[model samples]
Target: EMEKEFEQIDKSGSWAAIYQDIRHEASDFPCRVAKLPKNKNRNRYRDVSPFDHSRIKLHQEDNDYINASLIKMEEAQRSYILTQGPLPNTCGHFWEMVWEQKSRGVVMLNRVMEKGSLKCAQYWPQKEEKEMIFEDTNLKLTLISEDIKSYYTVRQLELENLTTQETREILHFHYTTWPDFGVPESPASFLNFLFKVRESGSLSPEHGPVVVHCSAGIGRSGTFCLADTCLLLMDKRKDPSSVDIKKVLLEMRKFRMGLIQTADQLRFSYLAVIEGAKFIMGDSSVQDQWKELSHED
Candidate 1:
């Protein structure tokens, strides 16, 4: 049914209308906290805000608001802290959330700068700088190692709580090649990056929700979460046909608003899920094929 739905949608070429319907259904949720005067500057985009009911609350007293949502895919046992890219002032809050949530990884799907514009603040330490200190939250991030591939980078970062002197290693998965409003070059490439995240064991229930973000925290982040969740569901059900992508995406929108920004993103989610299902359905060679396809121009 999943593949059939995709084929029908593809043949009909009605992705835009389908995506618009989803947007209409999902856009009515309240985001009062993100619009508050005290928290006004915290959001990167005025129109894109986390729904108040599911937004991540910081542990600090009187300063709890952050433009982030805790999205739980209960059936998949997967959780992600979907948040907007950190603004210059909110970098401290961003790191604090990471520390408080006990998240072991940060999946950044956009670059700091894209198309000659600042998409996200440089929130982490680079190889040359090696260290970044956040006085607002009294947290420090030290770059331990860097592994660079063609389209993405894996960095080992040491996150230290200056107040308690406690430290934790956080995997920073930066997918640099994904354009701001565009899908990845191929689903194989996206899945390859996702599998790398999976291999890290960061998405398991044992850890806190992995922090996932792009510019608005909904588009690329939504695609990543949807593909990952659908594939996991397929693996558990042992039947790809059982997974309903639209329903799952609608469920995810209950926690975070306006996920899967464009119809193209929605379509890409289906594409990635279909490609990943092959591997789940016992196609062993597809992994090598994915690696090869991902590496191609």
Candidate 2:
């Protein structure tokens, strides 16, 4: 069914039309309903909103106030915890979610500071900085390792459960090129960063769902998930054309709203899917191309 749908899309080149259709359906979704109490808008600069169907609910033990969602893609066998960048007030909740969920990694697509504004709070422990202890959440995060790349940074984070005193390792992949409110410069740069994340094997279900965030957590973050999900689906089914990007995005939007925000972003996603399929289909030159684009070699 998906193959036939995509075949039609290819014949007429209706990616933009499909993107609009997806957004139109998303607008009708119950995005206004908040399953939990809304945050007090402590820092209003960041775009923070949660979808009703997919918002992550905290257990009764913790004071619930985190703008996060558990997005499950059963068909693709992938799970992602999508959330906004941590605010100063919600920093504790952010770490608590990481510890409680046993997530193996967090994929951050935005920088701490974008342009002249602060996009994400400095929530993690930095190099030469002391371990971050969240008094409200009974969690402490320590920096175990840091590897900086040309277009991305990989960190080994130590997440400790202060109550149980149990410790777990979390990989952090931060892509630095995705601009605010827009897509990355090229599919090569984005794909290179994505392949780096894949090498960590953090997105696999063997670990907890990977936590992904951006300023809004729905635009760039959504693009990452959609592209990654399509690739995984393609790999698992052993057929690149079997997945319909449009239908898959619509299914994802059922969990969160406003994925692939701009028409440019939507177009870039298709290019990424096509480019990523080349890599998956055993095009070694594409890998070399991304390596050149990554520029860390």
Candidate 3:
């Protein structure tokens, strides 16, 4: 039944229909997403807010608004901590959440600055800088190693909790070119980036949930999650035709609202999922195509 429905959606080539259906279904469901106008220090911008139910509650005594959430995919055995880029004031809380959650990685999809505005605060150390200390949260982040790639950069950060004297290594995977509220140029580049993340062992089940964020944490972030989930399902099922991209996306949205913000992003996600499935299913042409497509840039 699900396969037939998926085929209908795919055969129709109507991304708009799926997009609209998601929106309509979400609208009917009650959302207690707090508009924290009063909590000025919690969020970088007023528009970006986390849903009350699934929002990650900080272990702190007072400051709790960090604009992050814990997203779980039990079937895939994958967990992702979806969050906004840290604000200057909330950087401490950000690291605090990382420490408390024992998250192994931070997957940042946006640049430091965008459109002449601060999209995300520099939460880590600079090029020449060795370590950054967030005194407010009693946590310290040290740059241990760095690997620069064509489209993404990988960094191993050592996070130390001051009071307890406990420390852990965290992986930081930064995808530099993912635009604000826009999809990547091609599915090829994005898939390459995703696999690079997987190879890092950060997104693996052995580690804590990987922190994935792109500015608002719903648009580009959502695209990456949907594509990842769909491809994982395809791989797990051992059949590309068995997975339904739209259904996976809709289920993901139930955890985090407004995932895959635009119809175009949904379309692009489908393209990436289909392309990734081909590779997983051992299509020689598709494997070579993505390699050539990603390598050219």
Best candidate according to lDDT: 1
C-alpha lDDT of all candidate models, in order: 0.91, 0.80, 0.80
Clashes of each: 0, 0, 0
List the pairs of residues colliding in candidate 3. none
CA error at residue 202 for candidate 1, angstroms: 0.8
Q: Which ten residues in a row are the worst by lDDT in model 1?
A: 21-30
Runs of candidate 1 with Cα error greater than 4 angstroms are: none
lDDT of 3 by residue, 152-222 (tens): 78888899998999999888888988778788879898988887787788888878788899888888899
Q: Candidates ranked by TM-score, best first? A: 1, 2, 3
Which stretches of model 3 miss by more than 4 angstroms?
1-14, 27-33, 36-38, 283-292
Q: For residues 87-185, what per-residue lDDT tens digits would candidate 2 score against the true structure? A: 888888888888778789899999999999888899999963789899977888999889998778899988888889999998999888889778888
TM-score of 1: 0.97
- Work out how many backbone clashes candidate 3 has: 0
- Give the TM-score of each candidate: 0.97, 0.89, 0.89
RMSD vs true structure, all candidates: 1.4, 3.0, 2.9
Highest TM-score against the true fold, candidate: 1
Q: How well does model 1 score by local distance difference test?
A: 0.91
True-vs-predicted CA distance for residue 18, candidate 2, Å: 4.0
